[PDB]
């Protein structure tokens, strides 16, 4: 049985940790909501 707890405000924060790449990927989406890589 499931409950929620507040974790914070939804704000853009000046000088947050900037990271991650930007891949362009070929994906399929099935009826069950699963993404997969095409090639």
């Amino acid at each position: 049985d499931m409950y929620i707890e507040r974790a914070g405000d939804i704000t853009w924060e000046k000088d947050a940790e900037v990271t991650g790449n930007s891949p362009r990927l070929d994906v399929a989406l099935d009826e069950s909501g699963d993404f997969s890589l095409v090639e």
Partner: protein
Amino acid sequence: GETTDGVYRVMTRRLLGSTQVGVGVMQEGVFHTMWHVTKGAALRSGEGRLDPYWGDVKQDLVSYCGPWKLDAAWDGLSEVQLLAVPPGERAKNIQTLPGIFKTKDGDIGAVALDYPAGTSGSPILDKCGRVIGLYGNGVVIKNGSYVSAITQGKRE
């Protein structure tokens, strides 16, 4: 129940101790999460109850108390912030420039950041603090790393 706008953890006691199964966004009195986090079950906020109002397993989205409220969109250019809420850790902003899921039905923004499965539902923000979608449905790439769609619902 707590109806305050903001980001929330989704918790279960059904496993060992208290386990974070994911994250959602409270906005305009409606709780927004991913379907795979709750499987459409009811939720507790204190001694208030939240009942599911809308959902769709293919979009992997679910709204509680009211219809989906979040209509902001990635502009396909600017950087965004994942407001990540990892299990047992503080809310942290992680800024990134999204990649792309190319699909037969169209292109979606994608964010390439690794977090435990319990971070599913964490909101993705534009520069004005608006939620442009939720993190936690996507794919594992040729590296073993995770890439999530920017998953956004429709407003009516």
